[PDB]
């Protein structure tokens, strides 16, 4: 039920530019982590601002949107226990500057517009992200040969 | 156009299981060749068969069938100068027994049955297997920072 | 000669299972600890009673030892300055959860009772653990020949 | 059952000083093969020169003896359809030279005489080698979880 | 000119000795920092009392600088936004006892006397140690292709 | 003597554009060979006419010289027993798409106008290619710790 948690992941431009597709994903394998949902593609502005609604009365919104049309992304949907609040420390910090060396964005990125992932807030915001990325028919259900060896 | 060639690469339920699918990823990343579509989905048996139809008169025809839908895939089309070549010689000969150490099926398997990935044969094939897995909506078209360091 | 401080490790069931021993002992290598024991061997309820000793009024303590008995583990002894404390630190908190990211729990991990490593305690519980692990003659006693690179 | 035949891989004094031990191990878990017994020793000259009984007659029999016995080595047994001869690929061309990258030898040393590990030459001289290093209560059998996805 | 901010970073003997030279070369290329330039070389005494002026009335201060000239350093400069302290952190604590795994120190060494690398302190030493390991002709200036994928 | 045989290897521009100067480092370091020379620098055209006056009298060589000259290069002397050979060996086929899966070239690049990497030919060159690129006062001499566990 808790081990049912799921979290949205989405790999940003500058994380495809850069090559980090593999390690990305690969961090997230080696953790014991389920992997539900996956694809490569180029978000429509559309999209973007439905994603980002939050910052529509914020400063400078239209480059950020812009910047985000600016190349594809990899968004992707993981699967396990308090994966949420695991996938954020994973990540690291939002602004790399404070992220830790063995995080995601503390190994590949410097300054905070160009931070490479982005990863879902809390449970509620991953249920409203997951829907706006994905299909309920893109979600795939499997069960992983190691399970017991992960869970209890 | 040479530069554009496209291959069909998928990884198999093993893969999948095994997780291997970032180190896969991270193989084709590395060498310099451009990722144009990628999705997780799981396979009908309409799929497969259509996928496999030159294997329809073996007899192993519709185990190899069962098995291919008995887990997700990872389907994915990478480009870039002799892909479809190229991308053959990466994942190794396709007996892992042959394989060697270096290339992908050489380094993590042992059995025909259970040897990870899948790679297109030809241009030919390759351009029916594309075809057959992605929509034309799904390839992204898109440029590489570093094309310049990597394409004369 | 502090040195010369001895802790024991072992890789649980999960991590055998998961493949992770070569990983873990790289870890350890890396560091420049030096390697004093190592086996492979299937436990004991006995051996894990003897090890588990003060949980044994736990309501727990059954599904412990028969978890420790389901697999087999890598036991084995690493010698170093402050080993027992720094080889703590390498593999996290007990809780994976609350394991950072460059540990091996961080890293490889998920719940608790599936966190894939032991590492003692302090210096008289390593001592303790040893003794029941490993015969005198089980204790290899060499010099690295980067030691002086190493130590001050 | 061809999926369960053995060889005996030691990791020699170099290997052992030179901090190749998790590297190696992990080369044979990576690709699916099974650790069936590991060890870490000193190995005596009287052991020595069972193992190295054919060269008997040879002038540098002697130093064989001597270098094999200046270290700790690591024996260990691994399981798996035609590992013996898989093995033997994994490890390169007894020349390191000779050894091509992607191998433990190519990858990993340069001379002849440290050439950092030992795979058993065919299943009848695994058979030997087996015996000659471990003891029938220190093979361990045991089940990996990811078998199905492993072989047919 | 905050993007433009430049640290010295250097390996030293025990780094060389112990072959971490690409592997600390890595992690500071993964993470975006740019090489600007970079030389192996074995210090005079002469050119560790003025880099180590600092600490000339300390006891360890002649120790330090004879254990400094015992074998070859690896100076290099590295470039980008926020380095002196981002490269502090990426090195971890001074004293590998406090280092976190995931750093540097933290993952590759045990005592402070063997901390195999130095990293500016600050902008203003960062300044004066640029300034007494290289020439103003060995700095490199050259505009990275992923440049925009790093900074906005 | 023969194990004092030397090699001239350079990192092209793009290879360190494309950030593949540590892990061609740690290559080589791993391998056992000992790092003799280093720096970062621009190459002058004076320069690379000198390194490539072969093709003086070939088509496009003004274009080889330009491209040589468009980004800072990392020349790089390794000393060992037929480092020119292996070395050649590691490095892969001079033409990318002829290299295999675990050879630098093979690992990295596609098109023989983009091959990251150059390595001395043979002795003779190496030696005409040391002198040209390195002052005597550039090479270092020392001993690895590790050395009498790397050759006979």
Same mark, same amino acid.
């Given at each position: 039920?808790?081990?049912?948690? /799921?979290?949205?992941?989405?790999?940003?431009?500058?994380?495809?530019?850069?090559?980090?597709?593999?390690?990305?994903?690969?961090?997230?394998?080696?953790?014991?982590?389920?992997?539900?949902? *996956?694809?490569? @593609?180029?978000?429509?502005?559309?999209? *973007?601002?439905?994603? =980002?609604?939050?910052?529509?009365? /914020?400063?400078?919104?239209?480059?950020?949107?812009? =910047?985000?049309?600016?190349?594809?992304?990899?968004?992707?949907?993981?699967?396990?226990?308090?994966?949420?609040?695991?996938? /954020?420390?994973?990540?690291?910090?939002?602004?790399?500057?404070?992220? *830790?060396?063995? @995080?995601?964005?503390?190994?590949?990125?410097?300054?905070?517009?160009?931070?490479?992932?982005?990863?879902?807030?809390?449970?509620?915001?991953?249920?409203?992200?997951?829907?706006?990325?994905?299909?309920?028919?893109? *979600?795939?259900?499997?069960?992983?040969?190691?399970?017991?060896?992960? =869970?209890?």
């Amino acid at each position: 039920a808790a081990n049912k948690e /799921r979290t949205f992941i989405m790999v940003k431009p500058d994380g495809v530019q850069r090559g980090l597709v593999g390690k990305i994903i690969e961090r997230f394998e080696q953790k014991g982590f389920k992997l539900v949902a *996956l694809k490569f @593609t180029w978000a429509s502005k559309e999209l *973007l601002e439905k994603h =980002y609604a939050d910052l529509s009365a /914020r400063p400078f919104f239209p480059g950020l949107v812009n =910047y985000m049309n600016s190349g594809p992304v990899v968004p992707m949907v993981w699967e396990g226990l308090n994966v949420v609040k695991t996938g /954020r420390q994973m990540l690291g910090a939002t602004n790399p500057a404070d992220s *830790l060396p063995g @995080t995601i964005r503390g190994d590949f990125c410097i300054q905070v517009g160009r931070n490479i992932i982005h990863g879902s807030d809390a449970v509620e915001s991953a249920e409203k992200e997951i829907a706006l990325w994905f299909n309920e028919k893109e *979600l795939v259900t499997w069960t992983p040969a190691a399970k017991d060896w992960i =869970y209890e």
